[PDB]
Amino acid sequence: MNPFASLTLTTLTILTIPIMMSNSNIYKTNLYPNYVKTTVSYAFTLSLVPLLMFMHTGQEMIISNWHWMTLQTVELSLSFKMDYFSVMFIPVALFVTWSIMEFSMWYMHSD
Amino acid sequence: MLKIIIPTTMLLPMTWMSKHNMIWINATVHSLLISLISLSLLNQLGENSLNFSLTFFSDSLSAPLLVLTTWLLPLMLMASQSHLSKETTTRKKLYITMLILLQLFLIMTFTATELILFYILFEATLVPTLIIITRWGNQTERLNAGLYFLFYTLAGSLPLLVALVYIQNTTGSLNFLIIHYWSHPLSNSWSNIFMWLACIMAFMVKMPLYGLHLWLPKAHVEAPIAGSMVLAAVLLKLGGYGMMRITTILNPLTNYMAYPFLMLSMWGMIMTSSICLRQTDLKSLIAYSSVSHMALVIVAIMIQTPWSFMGATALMIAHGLTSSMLFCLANTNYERVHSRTMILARGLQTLLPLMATWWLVASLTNLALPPSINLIGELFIITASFSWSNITIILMGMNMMITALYSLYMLITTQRGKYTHHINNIKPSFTRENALMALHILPLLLLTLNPKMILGPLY
Amino acid sequence: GAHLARRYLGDASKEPDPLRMPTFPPDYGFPERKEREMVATQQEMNDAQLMLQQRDYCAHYLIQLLKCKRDSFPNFLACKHEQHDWDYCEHLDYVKRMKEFERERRLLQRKKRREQREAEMARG
Amino acid sequence: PDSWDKDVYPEPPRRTPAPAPQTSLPNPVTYLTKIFDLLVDRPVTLAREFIEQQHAKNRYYYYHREFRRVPDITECEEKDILCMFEAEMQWRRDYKVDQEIVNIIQERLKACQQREGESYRQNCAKELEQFTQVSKAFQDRYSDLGAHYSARKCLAKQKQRMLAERKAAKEAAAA
Amino acid sequence: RHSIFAVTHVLIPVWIIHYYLKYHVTAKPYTVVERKPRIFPGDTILETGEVIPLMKEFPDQH
Amino acid sequence: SDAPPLTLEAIKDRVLYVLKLYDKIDPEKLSVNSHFMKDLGLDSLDQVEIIMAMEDEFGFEIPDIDAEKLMCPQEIVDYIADKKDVYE
Amino acid sequence: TLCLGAITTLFTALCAITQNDIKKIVAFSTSSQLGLMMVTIGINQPHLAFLHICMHAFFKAMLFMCSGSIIHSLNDEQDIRKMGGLYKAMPFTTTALIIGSLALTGMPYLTGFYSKDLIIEAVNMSYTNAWALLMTLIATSLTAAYSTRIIFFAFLGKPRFPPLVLINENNPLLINSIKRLLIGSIFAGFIISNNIPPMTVPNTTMPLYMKMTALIVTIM
Amino acid sequence: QQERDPWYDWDHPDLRLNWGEPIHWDLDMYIRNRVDTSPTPVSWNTMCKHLFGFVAFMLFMFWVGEIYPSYQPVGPKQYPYNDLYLERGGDPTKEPEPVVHYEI
Amino acid sequence: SFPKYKPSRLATLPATLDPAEYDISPETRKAQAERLAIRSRLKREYLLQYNDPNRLGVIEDPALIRWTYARSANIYPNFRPTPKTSLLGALFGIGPLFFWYYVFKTDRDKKEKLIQEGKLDQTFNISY
Amino acid sequence: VHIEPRYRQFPQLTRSQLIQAEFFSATMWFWILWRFWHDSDAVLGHFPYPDPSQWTDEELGILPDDE
Amino acid sequence: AFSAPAAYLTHQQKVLRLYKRALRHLESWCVHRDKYRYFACLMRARFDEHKNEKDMVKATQLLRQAEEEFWYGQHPQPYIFPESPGGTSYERYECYKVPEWCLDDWHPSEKAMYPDYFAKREQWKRLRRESWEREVKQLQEETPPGGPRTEALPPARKEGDLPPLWWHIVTRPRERPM
Ligand SMILES: CCCCCCCC/C=C/CCCCCCCC(=O)OC[C@H](COP(=O)(O)OCCN)OC(=O)CCCCCCC/C=C/CCCCCCCC
Ligand SMILES: CCCCCCCC/C=C\CCCCCCCC(=O)O[C@H](COC(=O)CCCCCCC/C=C/CCCCCCCC)COP(=O)(O)OCCN
Numbered sequence A: 001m002n003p004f005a006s007l008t009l010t011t012l013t014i015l016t017i018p019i020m021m022s023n024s025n026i027y028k029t030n031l032y033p034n035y036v037k038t039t040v041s042y043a044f045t046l047s048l049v050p051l052l053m054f055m056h057t058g059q060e061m062i063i064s065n066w067h068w069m070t071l072q073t074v075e076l077s078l079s080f081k082m083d084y085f086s087v088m089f090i091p092v093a094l095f096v097t098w099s100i101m102e103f104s105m106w107y108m109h110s111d
Numbered sequence B: 001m002l003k004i005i006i007p008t009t010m011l012l013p014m015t016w017m018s019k020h021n022m023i024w025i026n027a028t029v030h031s032l033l034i035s036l037i038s039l040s041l042l043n044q045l046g047e048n049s050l051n052f053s054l055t056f057f058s059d060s061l062s063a064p065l066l067v068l069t070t071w072l073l074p075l076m077l078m079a080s081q082s083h084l085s086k087e088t089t090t091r092k093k094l095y096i097t098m099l100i101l102l103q104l105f106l107i108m109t110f111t112a113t114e115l116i117l118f119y120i121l122f123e124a125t126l127v128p129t130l131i132i133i134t135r136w137g138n139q140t141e142r143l144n145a146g147l148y149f150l151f152y153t154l155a156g157s158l159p160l161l162v163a164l165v166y167i168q169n170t171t172g173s174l175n176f177l178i179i180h181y182w183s184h185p186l187s188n189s190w191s192n193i194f195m196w197l198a199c200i201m202a203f204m205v206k207m208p209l210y211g212l213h214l215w216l217p218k219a220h221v222e223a224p225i226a227g228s229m230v231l232a233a234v235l236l237k238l239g240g241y242g243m244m245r246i247t248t249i250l251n252p253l254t255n256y257m258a259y260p261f262l263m264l265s266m267w268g269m270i271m272t273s274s275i276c277l278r279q280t281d282l283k284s285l286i287a288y289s290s291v292s293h294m295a296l297v298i299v300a301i302m303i304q305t306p307w308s309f310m311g312a313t314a315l316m317i318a319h320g321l322t323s324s325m326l327f328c329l330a331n332t333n334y335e336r337v338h339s340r341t342m343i344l345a346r347g348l349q350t351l352l353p354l355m356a357t358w359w360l361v362a363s364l365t366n367l368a369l370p371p372s373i374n375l376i377g378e379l380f381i382i383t384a385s386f387s388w389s390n391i392t393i394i395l396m397g398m399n400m401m402i403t404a405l406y407s408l409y410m411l412i413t414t415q416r417g418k419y420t421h422h423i424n425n426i427k428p429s430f431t432r433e434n435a436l437m438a439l440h441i442l443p444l445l446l447l448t449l450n451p452k453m454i455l456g457p458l459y
Numbered sequence C: 001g002a003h004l005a006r007r008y009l010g011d012a013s014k015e016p017d018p019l020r021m022p023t024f025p026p027d028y029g030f031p032e033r034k035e036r037e038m039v040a041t042q043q044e045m046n047d048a049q050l051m052l053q054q055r056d057y058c059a060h061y062l063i064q065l066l067k068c069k070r071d072s073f074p075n076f077l078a079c080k081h082e083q084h085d086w087d088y089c090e091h092l093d094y095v096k097r098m099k100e101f102e103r104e105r106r107l108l109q110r111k112k113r114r115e116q117r118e119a120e121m122a123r124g
Numbered sequence D: 001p002d003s004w005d006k007d008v009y010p011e012p013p014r015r016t017p018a019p020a021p022q023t024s025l026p027n028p029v030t031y032l033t034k035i036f037d038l039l040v041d042r043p044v045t046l047a048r049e050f051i052e053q054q055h056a057k058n059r060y061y062y063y064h065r066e067f068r069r070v071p072d073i074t075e076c077e078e079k080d081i082l083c084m085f086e087a088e089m090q091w092r093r094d095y096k097v098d099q100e101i102v103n104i105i106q107e108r109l110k111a112c113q114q115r116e117g118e119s120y121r122q123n124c125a126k127e128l129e130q131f132t133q134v135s136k137a138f139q140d141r142y143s144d145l146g147a148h149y150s151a152r153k154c155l156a157k158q159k160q161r162m163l164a165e166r167k168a169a170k171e172a173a174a175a
Numbered sequence E: 001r002h003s004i005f006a007v008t009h010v011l012i013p014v015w016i017i018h019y020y021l022k023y024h025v026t027a028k029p030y031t032v033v034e035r036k037p038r039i040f041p042g043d044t045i046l047e048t049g050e051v052i053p054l055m056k057e058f059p060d061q062h
Numbered sequence F: 001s002d003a004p005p006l007t008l009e010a011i012k013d014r015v016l017y018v019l020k021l022y023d024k025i026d027p028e029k030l031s032v033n034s035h036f037m038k039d040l041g042l043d044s045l046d047q048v049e050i051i052m053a054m055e056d057e058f059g060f061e062i063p064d065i066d067a068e069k070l071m072c073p074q075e076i077v078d079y080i081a082d083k084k085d086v087y088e
Numbered sequence G: 001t002l003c004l005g006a007i008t009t010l011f012t013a014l015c016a017i018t019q020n021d022i023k024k025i026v027a028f029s030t031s032s033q034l035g036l037m038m039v040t041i042g043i044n045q046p047h048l049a050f051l052h053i054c055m056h057a058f059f060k061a062m063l064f065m066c067s068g069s070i071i072h073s074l075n076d077e078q079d080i081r082k083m084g085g086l087y088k089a090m091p092f093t094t095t096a097l098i099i100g101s102l103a104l105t106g107m108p109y110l111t112g113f114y115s116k117d118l119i120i121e122a123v124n125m126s127y128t129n130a131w132a133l134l135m136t137l138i139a140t141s142l143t144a145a146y147s148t149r150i151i152f153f154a155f156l157g158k159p160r161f162p163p164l165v166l167i168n169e170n171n172p173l174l175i176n177s178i179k180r181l182l183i184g185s186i187f188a189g190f191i192i193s194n195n196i197p198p199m200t201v202p203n204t205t206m207p208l209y210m211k212m213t214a215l216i217v218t219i220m
Numbered sequence H: 001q002q003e004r005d006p007w008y009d010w011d012h013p014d015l016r017l018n019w020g021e022p023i024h025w026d027l028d029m030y031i032r033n034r035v036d037t038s039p040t041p042v043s044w045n046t047m048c049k050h051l052f053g054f055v056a057f058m059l060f061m062f063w064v065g066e067i068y069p070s071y072q073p074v075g076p077k078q079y080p081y082n083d084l085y086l087e088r089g090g091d092p093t094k095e096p097e098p099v100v101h102y103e104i
Numbered sequence I: 001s002f003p004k005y006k007p008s009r010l011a012t013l014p015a016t017l018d019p020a021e022y023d024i025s026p027e028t029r030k031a032q033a034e035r036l037a038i039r040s041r042l043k044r045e046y047l048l049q050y051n052d053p054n055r056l057g058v059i060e061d062p063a064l065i066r067w068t069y070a071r072s073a074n075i076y077p078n079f080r081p082t083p084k085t086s087l088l089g090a091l092f093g094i095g096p097l098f099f100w101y102y103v104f105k106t107d108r109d110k111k112e113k114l115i116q117e118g119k120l121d122q123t124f125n126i127s128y
Numbered sequence J: 001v002h003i004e005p006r007y008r009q010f011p012q013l014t015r016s017q018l019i020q021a022e023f024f025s026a027t028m029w030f031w032i033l034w035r036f037w038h039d040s041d042a043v044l045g046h047f048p049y050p051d052p053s054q055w056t057d058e059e060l061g062i063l064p065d066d067e
Numbered sequence K: 001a002f003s004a005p006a007a008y009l010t011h012q013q014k015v016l017r018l019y020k021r022a023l024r025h026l027e028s029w030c031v032h033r034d035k036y037r038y039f040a041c042l043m044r045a046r047f048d049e050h051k052n053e054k055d056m057v058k059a060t061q062l063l064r065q066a067e068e069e070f071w072y073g074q075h076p077q078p079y080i081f082p083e084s085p086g087g088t089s090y091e092r093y094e095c096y097k098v099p100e101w102c103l104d105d106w107h108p109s110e111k112a113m114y115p116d117y118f119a120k121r122e123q124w125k126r127l128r129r130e131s132w133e134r135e136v137k138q139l140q141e142e143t144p145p146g147g148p149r150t151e152a153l154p155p156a157r158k159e160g161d162l163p164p165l166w167w168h169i170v171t172r173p174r175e176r177p178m
């Protein structure tokens, strides 16, 4: 159903996997920078799809998935906005970050 | 709720009946079990409090404090078994007895349904803390500190007792439920003004207020590690709990009477935040940070709005945990270097990386980083104050900046830079210290996952 | 721009005020003025959800351009006639606004000169 | 779905346009949607079918608690503690229900804003009017009680408001 | 093992997120809200089948 | 990758390369132990210029103190070797 | 907001046209671009500001990466007074920096055109503060003024680095990253600008002396 | 502490302090992570004058440009339905004053 | 000739521009020799302990202890109530309090008066 | 690839980097020229700016200082 | 950074330091090499003009005027070497220099790795322990009763000794440890 929400949330969720894996036996090896770069590349090419959906049909959404807490009449929930700005700036930021990480794999080789 | 009180009174003799080399293990294990049992009071009705008997009752404000105390005792036991290694068995058992008695008095204080019993236990908490400070300190100033820590309390709390009995002679009862249900307004008269002052001043000096805070740096510096933990984490919250319980009868005199205290709290929060910057000691900085946070809590309680009450409860719990962790972190360095100067040991990140991580996390939680409960309480208090008056934000905003500054300042002075080139006895961190840091820090994040447990009865 | 130089360095009463304008009746020197025609109705503009600033007398070409852009999505270079039509309609609106500005300016200067001439005649 | 009630949370009939392509180029979002369907939507649907099959083999019911009606604080004697306790509990329950009503109206308003896109200012101003009425009523009910609120304080505030209204009406009748 | 990274880093998270959004987030009202799609004069609505009218035959100049 | 592991031979070669290329020193008369004042005929300003040339050649600045007392090429190469931590 | 953006961009460009540290120059450059973005917001053109963000990210990141490559090549040297002729020693980074600088200055058909040109046109034809417009134009001139300073002092002339030459850029990671950002800064402006719906009424009737004023100030 | 010689072999190189020498009363303020009193290429009371003059001139010029704005020789923008009365807030039960725009 | 450089509190005079060093004297040379001797003796005392293989611990610096003691505990015994200290204490400890009290009291009085009149636009103020 | 230092000599270049840089500069210039050839208006404008002074007095509806 | 300073700077040292500072700032002003050579030759001629002055008062006055002129004409942003006290990478690697005594706290499982290195370290420690007493005796014998007058240290005089106070100078971590 409506892959917009699933893809928009997945492009943000899969960015946290290497952070969770920062304790396994991949963070102590030399393959971690390439792993993070590959994860960012995959996130970018996955986020390229909601951009296409928006440029086709102009689709925007809000996803209030987790209800955090309610203080009297005020309610605070985990809500994400997927309007033009977000779905347009996520791919650009991911592309720039991928390029910067590829550059850093060479610039920080002696760190 | 005797299922929590009795196990402490059983912790006493089993501590006194344990083997010479097994006191710490038994004490830690059974204190952790008691904390796990006390974790069952978090199930609170939204309508009214849990009234177990005619003497003990639990509210949504009492339960987080009880859990904090019961969780505190094992941490104090873990932190105390380093500098007490050379002590004799009898004196170790006496130290554990003082800690157990303090926890028992705090538990019976936070749940007493009658104001005179609450006062009796809230004053009975003075003896073990004074004994600990003046017997197991390190410097010659401890005695003086103890004297201050006594009299600054008693001179503020002896009038309260009179007020209390006077109330019992007028209304006819001091039970909290009857007091709340039969509450009546207080007229504007000098007699009622002095009644307000008598009822307020004890909890004001127990926070403490800006003008009455002189005892806190002495008590928190010359005390041993466990004394500092219990003073900065739970013993300070007694004043806030007492004010939140006692302000019910003080209306409507509070709106007129709160101006000097609010002004003092705001300006003293600014002043103590500024003082934290130019500090040559390490424990005094944490003490003054505690003073600033408690001044914010005082403002929240004084403005007397539901959002302010929620923020006050959250900030109380968060500050207790954070100050305890900071004191433990400072104590580790003090044990390494045998001095309290901040600039003595520098660049400890290159020597103790995991301790550097713990320092970073503690400093981040100290400056109200989102979405930690520290920021939740601070922001609720700030919003309530802004509703009270739109200018207050300025002062609040100023404090925030200064707060971050001094926090990072400390994190930069002790951890970053280069080492001192002549301290060669910095051994690698033990498992005990890392475990203590983790047990301090993990509950903060677990609570920020589910904040409604620490937002008090106004939720 | 030169209008700013004339207004701020010369005579302010000879130049129109962009804030309060027009200050003359719309039928002062006109024998008949036809009401400006709006093609799209309110419901169509509401359904298309253009904007609150794109709902001018030019909105019909904008709606057509948005539609033709939406159907011809994969190739984004198929919308040139509609874009040019919308730009031309915008240009016509802009030249209408310039006409109004010039009309108000010369109307104000003519009125002031006529008042001065009448005062000079009445001086005798 | 069938979980919530469609009258408490209303929505427009969801008119959506039909695809009317004017080019022979392969539309990429259609292919991507088909791939996403075939690769993601089917396994999750099968997993949900299995989980619902397991749930159907063991189903039990939980009931929404229904509370009686007890005398309120207006018909409570001054020093009769039991009736005051019952009235206070009932008033607190009513306060919580009132807050949840405000929450429902605010959720309606948020759906109003998000769904109507650019023309939100005009399409669903009815939700704005409903929220204005609800907020005004809630304010007049529980505005300035502050902390340590009680049924007696709300009753006193209401009595003051009715006295002011009566005085205003009597003064207006003398015009 | 050539492309198990995609199935272990993309397919599993998207499966979990799609399940959680489809059967838990959607089950509550006003959780996933989409702005109403634009309707232009000429398109036909799917469910109703009605077709919107052309916009007043506006005059053109080459 | 990064710079090669600079050695004493390279340091001496570069120092003699810049020094024998100085126009106030005969290339056929200077040696490793050639004192600047004694058997080369130079004043303090020339030694300052030589130190600055060394700094520009090796990309690091020698402080004014510890530069007044580098009076022969061997001393200069020894100072550079001690600062850069070279073995051979 | 408009006044703050104008003063920020003008002051930052004026400080940039003088710095000797290349990283400082590009930092003042991005600060001036942020000031221009706030100017765009102040004249009620939020979508133009967002488009400027999207376009600026590409070539500013590429310029920083080129500066970092130059720094790493010359043994971590950042002063432009000690970097001489790198036009032929580092050809790929020279090409990338030239393209990025031309895009930043507003080359009439690069990724920096579809944003900066529209921003300048909108500022010219709006009921705005005259002083803010003047500062914006002067900052537009100073942008090219500091860009040509970077190019001239970093790639033209004669070498000034230490004699031991370690200039080496034949590493696939750096080449690939710079190549991707170069393709972006060349084509992404045209691709994005033609694929989003019209979110504002365009400026269609303009005097010729105001339509091309951005080019005039850049060339000056 | 920044003015102290960086090339001296200090006992504490970061603080630039030797062991045993008297410590300034305000050392923690001058730790060079903080307030710096090093000499400046431009004298004080000259940097202050230049900076204050620049900021004051900028503020005054902004103010004078606010009351002498810049615009284009165009009339007000025209909108069809009473300046979009129904869409700019609504109130559809008041029949506002008609706003008529004529051709020109 | 050239514009003179005048030092300030936050921009001190450079060593090269100080007349105090060009005016040499045998007394100044003796003073510099004594200062160098003191510094060298302190450095030798530090280095003898620093390089000692046997010692393992912190080298106790009397200067640091003296500085902390002077900054923390030696202040009150050396305090005398003087007009300067009395005025400064009264000002810096009372004036801000009274100023903030007046500001907040004026603001709250204006707000309460506006509330009593009924002109404040309090709509949607559900949470306080 | 292995690149050795030069010590006052021009660094050893490679054919690959040279051809890459030349190709990218050439494609940038080709794109610029193509866009100018196809969309020159975006630089020069598409619609002429009318001269306000050259509008006859009648279409603006004014009377010649008579009434 | 290695040689102990003196109680004062002589006139020659002051003028040489001024000459070096002036040349560095002139090179900062004159970016290109040929222009820098031109103006450095001019500066050298200007310094050599008063080379043989014997009036100490006049020389001191000339130095004072020259330093005032330099302070007026100094570059606001002089070129600084990357690893100089003002450089962009001054203290960059101070976070990697771990003191050697930390190796004494390693776990035996960690010392199981690198056995030869720890054997060599044990030899070095034994040498230091043996030589310390001779070092301190030589230091106490070679000093005036009123303590040292300067920060310089004597060398090893007989064949069997090492220079006094050598352990922490020899065992510096590295210039680039990691
Ligand atoms: C409303 C709240 C109050 C507003 C803030 C006013 C200033 C607050 C006082 C600042 C406290 C500073 C003391 C404690 C911090 C420790 C000192 C410190 O940080 O060290 C100084 C350190 C070293 O300087 P460097 O140049 O980096 O030296 C490098 C070469 N070695 O620099 C600093 O960090 C100083 C920062 C102080 C900033 C003060 C000026 C800010 C004033 C801004 C006013 C304009 C507001 C903008 C209006 C926006 C329009 C709506
Ligand atoms: C850390 C040091 C802090 C010290 C704080 C101590 C000050 C506490 C405030 C005053 C306490 C005494 C108040 C009395 C207790 C309340 C009892 C009461 O309300 O009875 C009043 C009586 O009130 C009094 O008599 C009060 C007299 C006060 C005498 C002692 C003065 C103590 C110092 C005065 C100033 C303190 C207040 C500010 C102190 C700030 C902290 C420095 C009513 O009298 P009735 O018999 O009922 O008759 C009325 C009907 N006809």
Ligand SMILES: CCCCCCCCCCCC(=O)SCCNC(=O)CCNC(=O)[C@H](O)C(C)(C)COP(=O)(O)O
Binding pocket: F043, F044, F045, K011, K012, K015, K016, K022, K025, K026, K046, K047, K050, K051, K052, K053, K054, K059, K062, K063, K066, K067, K069, K070, K073, K074
């Ligand atoms: C860009 C910054 C501005 C430019 C800087 C301005 C500087 C102006 C320069 C003018 C110089 C003067 O007036 S100051 C005049 C200098 N005074 C003397 O020379 C008198 C005594 N001379 C000696 O002792 C030796 O000859 C000695 C020269 C030391 C060599 O000794 P060495 O054999 O051991 O190298």
